[PDB]
Design an enzyme around this catalytic site. Structure first.
Site, PDB file in Angstrom:
ATOM      1  CB  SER A  82      52.212  16.793  43.760  1.00 38.25           C
ATOM      2  OG  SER A  82      52.659  16.913  45.207  1.00 38.25           O
ATOM      3  CD  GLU A  87      45.990  14.233  48.735  1.00 33.69           C
ATOM      4  OE1 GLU A  87      47.026  14.895  48.496  1.00 33.69           O
ATOM      5  OE2 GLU A  87      45.221  13.680  47.785  1.00 33.69           O
ATOM      6  CG  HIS A 136      50.131  13.438  47.306  1.00 36.97           C
ATOM      7  ND1 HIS A 136      49.158  14.509  47.195  1.00 36.97           N
ATOM      8  CD2 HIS A 136      51.231  13.526  46.708  1.00 36.97           C
ATOM      9  CE1 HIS A 136      49.958  15.544  46.698  1.00 36.97           C
ATOM     10  NE2 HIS A 136      51.274  14.823  46.246  1.00 36.97           N
TER      11      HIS A 136
END
Length: 293
Positions: A143, A234, A264
């Site tokens: 991320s 995502e 994600h």
């Protein structure tokens, strides 16, 4: 779609806060700590201080002498910790057969951009000064931490630091502008803007197109071979697709894997998601491939 991911998406929506309600940061931070998975009991851990930051050496069984992974955790640059990511990092250590340096880098809004990049670069520099050869290193992260991976590499390169053998951004957030189409076109299938607020907190007035903030606008020339993991379901899909394209054009050997039906950082759900285990095994395998080359 596998039964596990279907049930995983079901649980996530049933357990999530409705859209648009403002969860205080300290509440989000504590919630993320409490739902964090316990690392497997064969994962060994050692606390160290690296570049003024707390960190843990995360060692699964089978770790090879001489090798190491600098790991940069997710959390939108405003949350996350060693505790939140110790489980997934242990499994990466296991698949890659290398110990991992899990960095508690400085977070916004207490420490806005570029604090996280400075910590990443310094931690990488710390690894080198400890005696780790560049060819025996890798940098990985998820991320926000996956974007941080690329920023650290670009920054380190600008500062004359040697490049490691590989880098594996997992569902990277590489564009602070959040203007990509997937934010619209994948928003329905994403159970994981609140992201805009985090960008505002991290940047704190800084240019959202700053190369060290948003590596999709950076010069990637000279970077190590890339493995980019991302889920088709995502909002950060286009970040990965555009990163791959940017890397290609800048000469970098990049490998983009868009995993179908995945969400994600699905890697983090490895205890109940077979694809989560599979992708972690793939990450570790790619690392070993680049080391044996």
């Amino acid at each position: 779609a596998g039964p596990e991911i279907v049930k995983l998406k079901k649980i996530l929506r049933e357990k999530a806060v409705p859209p648009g309600t403002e969860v205080p940061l300290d509440v989000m931070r504590k919630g993320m700590e409490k739902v964090a998975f316990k690392a497997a009991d064969d994962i060994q851990v050692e606390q160290v201080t690296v570049a003024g930051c707390a960190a843990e050496w995360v060692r699964a069984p089978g770790c090879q002498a001489g090798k190491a992974i600098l790991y940069l955790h997710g959390g939108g640059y405003v949350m996350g910790s060693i505790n939140t990511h110790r489980s997934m990092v242990g499994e990466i250590s296991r698949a890659s057969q290398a110990a991992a340096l899990l960095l508690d880098y400085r977070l916004a809004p207490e420490h806005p951009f570029p604090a996280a990049v400075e910590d990443g670069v310094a931690a990488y520099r710390w690894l080198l000064d400890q005696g780790f050869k560049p060819q025996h290193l890798s940098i990985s992260g998820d991320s926000a931490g996956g974007g941080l991976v690329l920023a650290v590499l670009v920054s380190a390169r600008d500062q004359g630091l040697p490049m490691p053998a590989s880098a594996i951004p997992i569902s990277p957030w590489a564009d602070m502008t959040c203007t990509n189409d997937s934010f619209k076109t994948r928003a329905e299938a994403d159970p994981m803007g609140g992201i805009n607020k985090m960008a505002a907190r991290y940047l704190n007035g800084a240019d959202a197109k700053h190369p060290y903030a948003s590596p999709n606008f950076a010069n990637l020339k000279g970077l190590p071979p890339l493995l980019i993991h991302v889920g088709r379901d995502e909002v950060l899909l286009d970040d990965s697709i555009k990163l791959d394209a940017k890397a290609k054009a800048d000469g970098v050997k990049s490998t983009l894997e868009i995993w179908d039906d995945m969400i994600h950082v699905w890697h983090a759900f490895h205890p109940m998601l077979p694809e989560g285990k599979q992708a972690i095994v793939r990450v570790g395998e790619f690392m070993r491939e680049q080391w044996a080359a």
